[PDB]
Design a protein around this ligand. Structure first.
Ligand SMILES: [Cl-]
Ligand SMILES: [Cl-]
Lengths: 120, 121
């Protein structure tokens, strides 16, 4: 149920393939419809989740470098997939920028994203 | 400078290869020397970092399933590599467990790891 296209609630989208043994691969687009905002996504998921109605744990990383931009930063999303009628991937994220050692305490932003199969 | 073996300060280790265009691939071992605690690691790094002494941003994920255990959870590490004599990878991590919807607010632990090229005392 993970493979396919997902949309956060702010205008981003990603397209992921879930491999049989736990691989996540795909592309993250920070702005729907803007190909210059597409970045490689790689991660992992639990490929044998519990059957008791629990979500499926997963995570992935985007380093914010492509052929048009290098923000010298990377974001990780940690969360769980919940299937069904209103399938969602609920996540929290960490965005770390490369910094000098003096600025290392300002290196990491935190936030959250909810991904759905339909646009907000 | 990233490719190789790293140790956190609590007894874990990982071995990563940094590909030329930003891939991180490797194995994470929660307990040094215990092969049944080895898990696949996949992530990304900035393969053209700033040259001004800034660290190199990176992140990776481990899903805690292998042939011996399935914790139904996954951890992501977000941080930066700093090279030199005492090279380190400074990170913060998120550990999310699959939960029921009623327990979803108890799903995600947060913490930090500092990885070095040599083992802690
Ligand atoms: Cl796979
Ligand atoms: Cl690569």
């Amino acid at each position: 149920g993970i493979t396919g296209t997902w949309y956060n609630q702010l205008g981003s989208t990603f397209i992921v393939t879930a491999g049989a043994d736990g691989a996540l691969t795909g592309t993250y687009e920070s702005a729907v419809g803007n190909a210059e905002s597409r970045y490689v996504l790689t991660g992992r998921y639990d490929s044998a989740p519990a059957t008791d109605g629990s979500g499926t744990a997963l995570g992935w990383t985007v380093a914010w470098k492509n052929n048009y931009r290098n923000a010298h930063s990377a974001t990780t999303w940690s969360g769980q997939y919940v299937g069904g009628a209103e399938a969602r991937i609920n996540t929290q994220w960490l965005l770390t920028s490369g910094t000098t050692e003096a600025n290392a305490x300002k290196s990491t932003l935190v936030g959250h994203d909810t991904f759905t199969k339909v646009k907000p």
